[PDB]
């Protein structure tokens, strides 16, 4: 069901949270080799999550589930904000700009925290 598809996408999202928090610890510790690997892992996780969210949104559209479509449109917009900040984080890592990396990291956390009440609303709407 689209609802089990959303649970699967939610689990992929929680996996990125776990890896993100491990990566933050590695960044603080100056373990740059670990950070590089975690950032590759996060890029794959976000790419997979984005694709699952699109399939869920398209399915809700095909189902005429207008409330779910509204919430998913808002959610995928916020998701792209996270993605842009993530990509900027990766560039800051490549550039050796630890100040920007710190800034982007905090921002990604607040964008992710803010978007959680909406994430729970979608689960109920689908």
Ligand X SMILES: NCCc1c[nH]c2ccc(F)cc12
Burial bucket for residue 38 (CB in 10 Å: 0-12, 13-18, 19+):
buried
- Chosen residue from 98, 114, 116, 124 binding ligand X by CB under 6 A: 98
User: Closest approach of Cβ 27 to ligand X, in Å?
Assistant: 8
**Cβ proximity of 71 and 124 under 8 Å:** no
Span near ligand X by CB under 6 A; candidates 7-15, 47-55, 63-71, 99-107: 99-107
Under the criterion CB under 6 A, does residue 103 sit at the interface with ligand X?
yes
- Chosen residue from 102, 107, 111, 119 binding ligand X by CB under 6 A: 102
Indicate the residue among 79 and 104 with the shorter CB distance to ligand X. 104
Burial bucket for residue 53 (CB in 10 Å: 0-12, 13-18, 19+):
buried
**Cβ proximity of 40 and 94 under 8 Å:** no
Indicate the residue among 33 and 99 with the shorter CB distance to ligand X. 99
Print the binding letters for residues 22-41 with ligand X: x by CB under 6 A, - otherwise: --------------------
CA distance 47 to 51: 6
Contact residues: ligand X, CB under 6 A: 98-99, 102-103
């Amino acid at each position: 069901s689209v609802k089990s598809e959303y649970a699967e996408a939610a689990a992929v999202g929680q996996e990125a949270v776990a890896v993100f928090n491990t990566m933050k610890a590695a960044f603080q510790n100056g373990d740059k080799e670990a950070v590089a690997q975690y950032l590759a892992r996060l890029a794959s996780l976000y790419t997979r999550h984005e694709e699952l969210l699109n399939r869920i949104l398209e399915k809700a559209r095909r189902e005429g589930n207008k409330e779910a479509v509204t919430l998913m449109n808002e959610f995928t917009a916020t998701f792209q904000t996270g993605k842009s900040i993530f990509n900027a984080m990766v560039a800051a890592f490549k550039n050796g700009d630890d100040d920007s990396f710190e800034s982007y990291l905090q921002a990604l956390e607040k964008v992710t925290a803010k978007g959680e009440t909406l994430a729970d609303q979608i689960a109920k709407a689908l």
